[PDB]
Amino acid sequence: KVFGRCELAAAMKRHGLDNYRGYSLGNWVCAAKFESNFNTQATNRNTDGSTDYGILQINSRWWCNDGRTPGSRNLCNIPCSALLSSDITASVNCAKKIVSDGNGMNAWVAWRNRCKGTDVQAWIRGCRL
Numbered sequence: 001k002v003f004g005r006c007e008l009a010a011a012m013k014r015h016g017l018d019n020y021r022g023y024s025l026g027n028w029v030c031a032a033k034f035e036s037n038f039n040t041q042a043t044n045r046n047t048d049g050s051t052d053y054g055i056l057q058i059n060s061r062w063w064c065n066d067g068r069t070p071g072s073r074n075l076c077n078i079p080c081s082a083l084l085s086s087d088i089t090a091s092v093n094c095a096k097k098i099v100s101d102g103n104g105m106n107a108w109v110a111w112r113n114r115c116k117g118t119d120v121q122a123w124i125r126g127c128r129l
């Protein structure tokens with residue numbers, strides 16, 4: 001599913017991401033925009049053989065099982081295919097663990113490089129939230 005910007009912000013707020021671990025909602029919508037263009041079905045292969053999955057491009061080396069990343073963990077305890085559902089529950093729950101891992105949303109390189117330090121509130125401007 002390809003989410004609308006305000007549509008995603010609302011689903012994200014309902015699932016408890018607004019200021020989760022101190023990160024305002026616009027950070028999460030920004031991250032989704034540049035990770036996946038709001039597409040739940042986005043997948044991307046990494047150089048190390050792992051793959052990023054879903055709206056927030058969660059990686060198979062640490063967070064989900066896809067059966068093809070040797071020596072990897074499944075810390076969110078889910079198949080990576082769950083991260084591609086039009087229901088973003090799996091992705092949000094896993095992102096809560098990821099953002100809690102020590103480095104905040106720096107875990108998302110696209111957030112560090114494209115969202116961090118910017119006016120992220122722009123990503124939720126105009127939405128009925």
Ligand SMILES: [Cl-]
Nearest residue numbers: 024025026121
């Ligand atoms: Cl915000």
Ligand SMILES: [Cl-]
Nearest residue numbers: 067068069070
């Ligand atoms: Cl694996």
Ligand SMILES: [Cl-]
Nearest residue numbers: 011087088089
């Ligand atoms: Cl949802």
Ligand SMILES: [Cl-]
Nearest residue numbers: 022103104105
């Ligand atoms: Cl932090």
Ligand code: NA
Nearest residue numbers: 060064072073
């Ligand atoms: Na894995």
